[PDB]
Design a protein around this ligand. Structure first.
Ligand SMILES: *C(=O)[C@@H]([C@@H]1N=C(C(=O)O)[C@@H](S[C@@H]2CN[C@@H](C(=O)N(C)C)C2)[C@@H]1C)[C@@H](C)O
Length: 490
């Protein structure tokens, strides 16, 4: 009924499957009712690009279209294929344009289940042109992030895609742990599985019945690759990653490539925190000037994906204990431990406006119900302050900022989801120094007390969620700390 095309019949399912009949009609008329997709290499390139979106499991919309396309192809229904491909490429183009704007909706909040708006005029133009110059492939590639980050993940996806269904024995072992020097049953499976992730297995010795030196370094860099303690020990966490299928790895790659559409371009001066990587990097004038491990929010108080700017830096910050924390977390502990306040250098304050220190002794602690308790808590400046020596002020509606910690031992863990959402920074001192250097700010000597310092040039802070990324020659994988890789894996 609905698609007014001469060479498509009325009862074809394409009439219901198509999103923008109007715009498809126009394109086909402008090209004298000719097929855009009769070149195989071109259809295959576009089916490949939709497999990616399929595996990433974030768009039932594109999955529907791909199944339908793949179904028209198996039956040699090349007229129906042609028109549905054209409609689906319009969607791909809306998708390419909209993700950086509003893609947070599809990858974190909800999903791309409903047809997108048509693409911009600029895009419809580029398409018309591509149709005439027989360069649809170039058009699709042009509408992928021109980011080496993207292309490195796609390169790896393409390699692994080539060997998806090569069966490879599951790596097994007798005991839950297995240390250098122990007997080793399944050496073949283990080495095959180190190879899957393109670790160099060439120097590993053959048919040695034990976990020898030749295996230590490959195992330790497989561990590093997966952000695990490089202890050399084949335990459950190692085996989880060793024994992941190529299907599972391609899904991780797919999701993480598509996620790079969200991440806001790249700036010369910029700060990136990768949550599941529990790390962060400060670029300034094209240069990586600083990197550091961080602690991010716990699963229950997660660090959200967001973009803000670093406005100012506080040296020797006092910590104004927010209400929610005082009421639930702190007052009930001072109600029992009558030494809490003094140990944590935490003084009682009339109000944030009226900063009068009240001695804890002037208070009927039996009498206090935390919910209604009328004064406020303020931790004095110091090394043992919850914010340590440095607060990094990133003002935003969610009250998330970067700060030093006194609990520097927590950086020793592989998995660093301990905070109430804020981001604790190892080597805050160096971070402070490089910021001030690159702002053209000097300090005649280190301040006695609390010092606010506004940045001349505010830096964008991007907090991303990236479970796969390319860095110094190699592809890193990380556990799905906050469960957003959920659908990709099954
Ligand atoms: C940021 O997360 C909040 C602020 N920053 C820190 C932090 O990095 O965790 C917390 S302090 C810590 C978590 N809850 C407190 C607690 O459990 N007790 C028993 C005192 C200590 C702090 C809440 C916030 C400003 O957004």
């Amino acid at each position: 009924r609905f698609v007014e095309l001469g060479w498509i019949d009325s009862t074809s399912p394409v009439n219901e499957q198509i999103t923008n009949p109007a715009l498809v009609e126009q394109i086909y008329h402008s090209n004298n009712d000719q097929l855009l997709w009769s070149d195989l290499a071109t259809a295959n390139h576009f089916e490949a690009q939709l497999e990616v979106i399929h595996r990433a499991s974030f768009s039932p919309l594109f999955s529907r279209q791909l199944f339908a396309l793949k179904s028209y192809r198996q039956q040699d229904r090349w007229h129906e294929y042609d028109v549905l491909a054209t409609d689906t490429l319009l969607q791909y183009l809306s998708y390419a344009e909209q993700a950086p704007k509003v893609g947070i909706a599809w990858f974190f909040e909800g999903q791309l289940d409903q047809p997108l708006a048509p693409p911009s005029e600029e895009a419809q133009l580029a398409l018309h042109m591509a149709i005439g110059n027989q360069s649809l492939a170039r058009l699709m590639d042009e509408y992928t992030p021109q980011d080496p980050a993207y292309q490195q993940l796609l390169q790896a996806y393409q390699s692994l895609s080539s060997i998806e269904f090569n069966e490879v024995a599951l790596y097994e072992q007798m005991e839950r742990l297995k240390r250098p020097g122990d007997p080793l049953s399944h050496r073949e499976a283990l080495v095959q599985r180190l190879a899957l992730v393109n670790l160099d297995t060439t120097s590993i010795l053959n048919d040695v019945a034990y976990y020898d030196a030749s295996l230590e370094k490959p195992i330790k860099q497989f561990q590093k690759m997966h952000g695990l303690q490089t202890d050399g020990v084949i335990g459950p966490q190692t085996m989880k990653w060793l024994n992941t299928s190529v299907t599972e790895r391609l899904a991780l790659l797919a999701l993480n490539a598509e996620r790079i559409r969200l991440w806001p371009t790249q700036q010369d001066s910029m700060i990136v925190v990768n949550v599941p990587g529990f790390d962060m990097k400060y670029w300034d004038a094209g240069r990586e000037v600083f990197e550091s491990k961080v602690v991010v929010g716990k699963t229950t108080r997660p660090t959200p994906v967001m973009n803000t700017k670093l406005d100012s830096l506080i040296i020797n910050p006092t910590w104004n204990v927010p209400h929610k924390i005082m009421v639930e977390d702190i007052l009930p502990m001072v109600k029992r431990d009558s030494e809490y306040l003094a140990n944590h250098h935490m003084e009682i304050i009339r109000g944030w406006s009226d900063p009068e220190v009240i001695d804890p002794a002037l208070i009927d602690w039996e009498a206090v119900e935390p919910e209604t308790f009328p004064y406020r808590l303020r931790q004095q400046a110091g090394v043992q302050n919850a914010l340590g020596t440095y607060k990094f002020n990133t003002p935003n509606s969610r009250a998330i900022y970067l700060h030093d910690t006194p609990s520097k031992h927590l950086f020793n863990n592989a998995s660093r989801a301990f905070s109430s959402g804020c981001i604790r920074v190892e080597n805050a001192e160096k971070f402070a120094q490089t910021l001030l250097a690159n702002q053209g700010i000097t300090l005649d000597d280190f301040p006695v007390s609390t010092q606010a310092i506004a940045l001349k040039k505010r830096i964008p802070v991007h907090i991303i969620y990236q479970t796969v990324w390319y860095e110094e020659g190699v592809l890193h994988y990380r556990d799905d700390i906050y469960h957003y890789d959920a659908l990709a894996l099954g």
